[PDB]
Design an enzyme around this catalytic site. Structure first.
Site, PDB file in Angstrom:
ATOM      1  N   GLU A  54       0.851  -1.228   0.000  1.00 27.66           N
ATOM      2  CA  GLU A  54       0.000   0.000   0.000  1.00 27.66           C
ATOM      3  C   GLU A  54       0.866   1.249   0.000  1.00 27.66           C
ATOM      4  OE1 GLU A  54      -2.671   0.011   3.329  1.00 27.66           O
ATOM      5  OE2 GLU A  54      -3.091   2.144   3.211  1.00 27.66           O
TER       6      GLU A  54
ATOM      7  N   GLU B 297      -2.467  10.630   3.439  1.00 32.14           N
ATOM      8  CA  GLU B 297      -3.537  10.678   4.407  1.00 32.14           C
ATOM      9  C   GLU B 297      -3.593  12.076   5.055  1.00 32.14           C
ATOM     10  OE1 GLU B 297      -2.233   6.961   6.221  1.00 32.14           O
ATOM     11  OE2 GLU B 297      -4.380   6.294   6.100  1.00 32.14           O
TER      12      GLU B 297
END
Ligand SMILES: [Ca+2]
Length: 213
Positions: free
Chosen positions: A104, A108
């Site tokens: 991943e 964020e």
């Protein structure tokens, strides 16, 4: 894998994207994904919503690509939600549920402070690559372009076309789906701040671009 594309988010493409619906991730994701929580605005945006259908229950939105994407430049023009205890994100993801290793790559926005962005990535489930960067503006205020260039031996992250961070160690290798979500946490107060139930909250995505390596 998928080829280069640009989506202006003038409408919802259901052959190309899919909405999480009807379940909670569990653990820290203190919400149930709902299809209704992903919507398109009349301004050409995808909007993700954090809403509350009943006391202490939260509905959230997560949208994912149907195809999987490999090496190259991922760009998102977006503005995150602003509130203690939440995250708005743009990331790549594959893992055990897909028959692969957990690989991943993250951008964020921790709602407790939308003047910072957090970068991170996981390679075969090994993470802890958190890097927090001061933006010099408040992301929640206006659209900005955020990006990562995922190469074989390095990931490079950009804010409005400017290089902000580079990683070179234990780099991900398995193509993943392009994803965006907005959610309230529990059990992660030190990281996100506690969530205070305030709703509705929204994160907006103007457009997404991927350019193959
Ligand atoms: Ca747009």
């Amino acid at each position: 894998t998928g080829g280069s594309f640009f989506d202006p988010f003038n409408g919802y493409n259901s052959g190309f994207w899919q909405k999480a619906d009807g379940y909670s991730n569990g653990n820290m994701f203190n919400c149930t994904w709902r299809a209704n929580n992903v919507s398109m605005t009349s301004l050409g945006e995808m909007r993700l919503a954090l809403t509350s259908p009943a006391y202490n229950k939260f509905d959230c939105g997560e949208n994912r690509s149907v195809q999987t994407y490999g090496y190259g430049l991922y760009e998102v023009r977006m503005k995150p939600a602003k509130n203690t205890g939440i995250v708005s994100s743009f990331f790549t993801y594959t893992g055990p549920t897909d028959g692969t290793p957990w690989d991943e790559i993250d951008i964020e926005f921790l709602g407790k402070d939308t003047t910072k962005v957090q970068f991170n990535y996981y390679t075969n489930g090994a993470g802890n690559h958190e890097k927090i960067v001061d933006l010099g503006f408040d992301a929640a205020n206006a659209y900005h372009t955020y990006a990562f260039d995922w190469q074989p031996n390095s990931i490079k992250w950009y804010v409005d076309g400017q290089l902000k961070h580079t990683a070179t160690n234990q780099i991900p290798t398995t193509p993943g789906k392009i994803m965006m979500n907005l959610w309230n946490g529990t059990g992660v107060d030190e990281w996100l701040g506690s969530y205070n139930g305030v709703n509705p909250l929204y994160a907006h995505y103007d457009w997404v671009r991927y350019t193959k390596k």
